[PDB]
Write a protein that binds this DNA or RNA. Structure first.
Length: 94
DNA sequence: TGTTATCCACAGG
DNA sequence: CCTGTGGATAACA
């Protein structure tokens, strides 16, 4: 699984643009999908936190680490996030 | 308002 | 390098 693939898939899935994933915009409508894309990058690939960060608009590796934890948390608190996680992995590992 | 996604300064594996 | 921690803060909800 490649990061570029994850970004395109996630963008389409949430009906937003790949550029939104790279953008510094923090609005939840795009930051959530972004965090989901970053967490997937970490769970689906062997890329380090710094490499995933660079891959998402030059973000710090700690931001990716935060993303992973936030998505972990949300997966436990929201059935919809839990579903998006499953749906996306289903697609990406096809 | 209160919350948080992001970056920075560090640090031992 | 890598993964983590502690802290600030500008953006968010």
């Amino acid at each position: 699984v490649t990061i570029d693939n994850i970004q395109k898939t996630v963008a389409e899935y949430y009906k937003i643009k790949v550029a939104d994933l790279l953008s510094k915009r923090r609005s939840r409508s795009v930051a959530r999908p972004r965090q989901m894309a970053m967490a997937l990058a970490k769970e689906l690939t062997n890329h380090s936190l710094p490499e995933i960060g660079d891959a998402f608009g030059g973000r710090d590796h700690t931001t990716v680490l935060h993303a992973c934890r936030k998505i972990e948390q949300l997966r436990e608190e929201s059935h919809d996030i839990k579903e998006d996680f499953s749906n996306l992995i289903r697609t990406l590992s096809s």
